[PDB]
Amino acid sequence: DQLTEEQIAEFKEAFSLFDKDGDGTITTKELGTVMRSLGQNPTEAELQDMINEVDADGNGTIDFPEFLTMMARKMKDTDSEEEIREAFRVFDKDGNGYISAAELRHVMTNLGEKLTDEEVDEMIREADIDGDGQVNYEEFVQMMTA
């Protein structure tokens, strides 16, 4: 199947929305143009971080092969590899990304369905990859290892 000729032109129409002067490059200044017209005024770091993740060539701009991959993730109704991140970032402190291991005991025993002490005790002892009590997203990657 892959992509048909009619389908190829479809992405070009969507690709042309981010190429005002062509060049096959999606620069930082171009993002600021479209976001202002969409009721957004984000900081420079936000757009700098946004383009950073969706950049694989390393030049700084975005080409079609990177554009095609990011669209497929959007087409998915639910990205199961992102929701766990959002739950961590709700309880995240000052953007460190390293959550205290002792803090998780309270949020699991009381918030939600009140998980039992014995089960959450097994949770922390298996999540003690750090060995000191400051867990991070490294628990998430082993959660989805299979």
């Binding site: 949020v107 939600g112 998980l115 949770m123």
Partner: peptide, 21 residues
């Protein structure tokens, strides 16, 4: 409500991981 909803995602993820392997 945001905190209460966010707890259940982790709860179910841990339950699945414990019950699979």
């Amino acid at each position: 409500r945001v905190k209460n909803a966010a707890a259940n995602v982790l709860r179910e993820t841990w339950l699945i991981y414990k019950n699979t392997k």
